[PDB]
Amino acid sequence: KVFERCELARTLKRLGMDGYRGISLANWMCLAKWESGYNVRATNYNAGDRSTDYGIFQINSRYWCNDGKTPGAVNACHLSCSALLQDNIADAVACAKRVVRDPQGIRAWVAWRNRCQNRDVRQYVQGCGV
Ligand code: NA
Numbered sequence: 001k002v003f004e005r006c007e008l009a010r011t012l013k014r015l016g017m018d019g020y021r022g023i024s025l026a027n028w029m030c031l032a033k034w035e036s037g038y039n040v041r042a043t044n045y046n047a048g049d050r051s052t053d054y055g056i057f058q059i060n061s062r063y064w065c066n067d068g069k070t071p072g073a074v075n076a077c078h079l080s081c082s083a084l085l086q087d088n089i090a091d092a093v094a095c096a097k098r099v100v101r102d103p104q105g106i107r108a109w110v111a112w113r114n115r116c117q118n119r120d121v122r123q124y125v126q127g128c129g130v
Contacts, residue, residue: 001087003038006128013130015093021100029124030116032056055084057096
């Protein structure tokens with residue numbers, strides 16, 4: 001499933017993402033937009049280090065979820081990476097919350113730095129009723 005902008009915005013708000021660890025809802029929307037284009041099935045293999053990014057937030061298999069084929073990996077979210085490909089994004093959200101509980105916060109994703117940081121991100125939630 002590929003979420004529509006406002007549909008996702010309302011879903012994330014209900015899941016308690018607004019202001020989570022100081023991160024505004026619009027920041028999470030900007031992150032999802034640039035990582036997967038709001039597509040829960042997005043997957044990207046990194047030939048360079050043998051890890052894969054999964055789902056709407058493109059969470060990496062080396063640290064956060066287990067896919068079994070990533071060398072020297074941990075599973076901090078204690079989830080199979082398969083869980084991050086579901087239409088129901090509850091597990092992906094719980095794992096995203098875990099990722100930002102680390103010192104880097106939202107900066108853990110380089111795309112956030114490149115296209116969201118210091119930018120006007122209001123556009124991602126405008127008119128959505130959140
Ligand atoms: Na892993």
